[PDB]
Design a protein around this ligand. Structure first.
Ligand SMILES: Nc1nc2c(ncn2[C@@H]2O[C@H](COP(=O)(O)OP(=O)(O)OP(=O)(O)O)[C@@H](O)[C@H]2O)c(=O)[nH]1
Ligand SMILES: [Mg+2]
Lengths: 380, 181
């Protein structure tokens, strides 16, 4: 109804065998979505939207391995819960099966019979479809051809905040229970509601195919540093219900022109120290070779900061990111790239100040026709 | 007119009588039929040849096995109905059904019928069986039964959708009219 995200991605590690990669939580596979309020109770259609991004290798194709841990698209699961946000479906019993849709890898039954007049050509889109389109498609449709391929959740809505629920109803929710907040601000801001949840939403990113006719297999792997190129751990929280990571990995859209991510990650740093840090990105071509997976450099690299140098933190909303290439010693040196332009907006304002005050400003074309998109949401 | 005693065997709650009542009487039994055994008669055609079927709706119970094994003599084709929703019925076909019909009729042709092929894709059946630690009988699994227990053909039926019912019984007949090699 707002076409947009609501709550942070509750994060579950899932095993290789269609099983919980963390089995210890097999009973505590729980999320409590906070901040629910008047508009939240009257939000016309809210859906808990589950995805699986298959960790491990690129493909389940026999003949080649891939560098284990490769986040690959595997589909979406959706049901609207507006009936339940009304509270009607009121039972701890209801272990809702969730029919999951893997993005349409239909290459098993429609291929065995095409004879006597073959005139048809197409590409490989079984996952290459924009996640925007998969999103809206599952929005409009009302059936899943899961064939059992789905997941089970028992659900209810509970009034009260983290505290009140965690006191009157801690039976469901202990302090080790995973938590996901609806991404934003409340209808009632208590003085001292000290959060730091900076949900970084990856909407998409455009990348030109380059020398290899395969659109270089983008894996935006962005590392958050101080103002001295020092990476920090946990800074990028990949999803809710799980601790952060030092550097975050993007889904390697397998030879895609304009990948659309829809990914979200929380940032939370020392609010006094976060002011004087930065971030850096890496855009590598991820080929089907492990040794080439590691040996390939991030043909494009990028770097972004935290506050505007005036001290104001980067404002909310979408902030574009250029994929910069070539010499990344320019762009991985502790401070030297902090002197250099690192994202679209600061670059065009640099070019404007050169237009008015031309003081040796020649933008490098390594800031080439590849770029990246991030929208910043900062619940500090 | 040529009759074939086609004693339809198979577990309880798996779809013998559902397939028969969809065949001889053309209705889908709503609830698990309490079966001892029955006699029917219909008029069916087999690959262009019309045939008579005097049929037997035997029990899937362990209790009246003596009566069902009295039914096995004079049988010319054994229709074993096992639930695709309940592949433990397939396992019972592997342990008792085919072995008992063969101990009472060796080399007498056997049709193998996978009841509820419509449930291999239905969400309820798949989810129930995955929660039971088993998968609905794939046509390869029933075909493995057929090759192993020398079934003339492994068919599948869905009495709910009226799927393959007449086909099941025509194949049962042609298991005898045209002996399989
Ligand atoms: N959905 C569905 N259910 C079926 C089908 N065939 C049988 N059943 C179920 O199976 C139950 C019992 O029917 P049968 O399989 O005929 O029972 P039986 O094999 O004759 O075994 P007994 O009657 O005990 O000797 C019914 O209540 C149905 O619910 C089918 O084709 N589709
Ligand atoms: Mg019966």
């Amino acid at each position: 109804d707002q076409s947009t995200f609501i709550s942070e991605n509750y994060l579950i590690r899932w095993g290789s065998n269609g099983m919980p990669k963390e089995i210890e939580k097999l009973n505590n596979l729980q999320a409590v979505f906070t901040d629910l309020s008047s508009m939240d109770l009257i939000r016309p259609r809210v859906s808990l939207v589950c995805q699986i991004v298959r960790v491990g290798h690129m493909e389940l194709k026999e003949g080649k391995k891939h560098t284990c841990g490769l986040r690959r698209p595997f589909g979406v699961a959706v049901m609207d819960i507006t009936d339940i946000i009304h509270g009607k479906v009121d039972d701890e019993e209801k272990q809702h099966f969730i029919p999951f849709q893997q993005i349409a890898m239909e290459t098993y039954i429609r291929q065995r019979q095409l004879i006597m007049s073959p005139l048809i050509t197409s590409h490989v889109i079984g996952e290459n479809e924009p996640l925007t389109s998969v999103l809206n498609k599952v929005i409009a449709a009302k059936e899943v051809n899961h064939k059992g391929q789905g997941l089970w959740v028992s659900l209810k809505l509970l009034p009260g905040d983290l505290t009140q629920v965690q006191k009157n109803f801690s039976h469901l929710v202990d302090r080790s229970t995973a938590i996901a907040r609806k991404m934003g601000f409340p209808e009632i801001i208590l003085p001292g509601d000290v959060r730091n949840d900076i949900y970084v939403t990856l909407i998409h990113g455009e990348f030109d195919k380059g020398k290899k006719k395969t659109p270089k297999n983008v894996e935006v792997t962005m590392s958050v540093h101080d103002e001295e190129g020092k990476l920090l751990e946990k800074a990028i929280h990949p999803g809710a219900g799980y601790e952060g990571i030092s550097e975050y990995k993007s889904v390697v859209y397998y030879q895609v022109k304009q990948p659309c991510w829809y990914e979200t990650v929380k940032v939370s740093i020392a609010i006094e120290e976060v002011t004087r840090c930065h971030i850096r990105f890496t855009f590598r071509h991820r080929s089907s070779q492990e040794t080439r997976d590691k040996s390939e450099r991030a043909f494009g690299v990028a770097f972004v900061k935290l506050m505007n140098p005036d001290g104001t933190t980067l404002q909310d909303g979408r902030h574009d990111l250029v994929v910069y290439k070539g010499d990344n010693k320019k762009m991985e040196d502790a401070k030297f790239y902090l002197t250099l332009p690192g994202t679209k907006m600061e670059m065009e304002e640099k070019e404007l100040q050169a237009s008015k005050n031309l003081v040796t400003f020649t933008p490098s074309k390594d800031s080439t026709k590849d770029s990246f998109q991030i929208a910043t949401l900062i619940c500090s | 007119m040529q009759s074939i005693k086609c004693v339809v065997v198979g577990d309880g709650a798996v779809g013998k009588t559902c397939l028969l009542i969809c065949y001889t009487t053309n209705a889908f039994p709503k609830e698990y039929i309490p079966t001892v055994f029955d006699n029917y008669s219909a008029q069916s055609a087999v690959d262009g040849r019309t045939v008579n079927l005097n049929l037997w709706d035997t029990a899937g119970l362990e209790e009246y096995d003596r009566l069902r094994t009295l039914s096995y003599p004079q049988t010319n084709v054994f229709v074993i109905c096992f639930s695709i929703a309940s592949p433990p019925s397939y396992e019972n076909v592997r342990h008792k059904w085919h072995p008992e019909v063969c101990h009472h009729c060796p080399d007498v042709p056997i049709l193998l019928v996978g009841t509820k092929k419509d449930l291999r894709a239905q969400p309820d059946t798949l989810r129930r069986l995955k929660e039971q630690g088993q998968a609905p009988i794939t046509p390869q699994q029933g075909q493995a039964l057929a090759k192993q227990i020398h079934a003339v053909r492994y068919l599948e039926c869905s009495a709910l959708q009226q799927d393959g019912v007449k086909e099941v019984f025509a194949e049962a007949v042609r298991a005898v009219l045209n002996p399989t090699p």
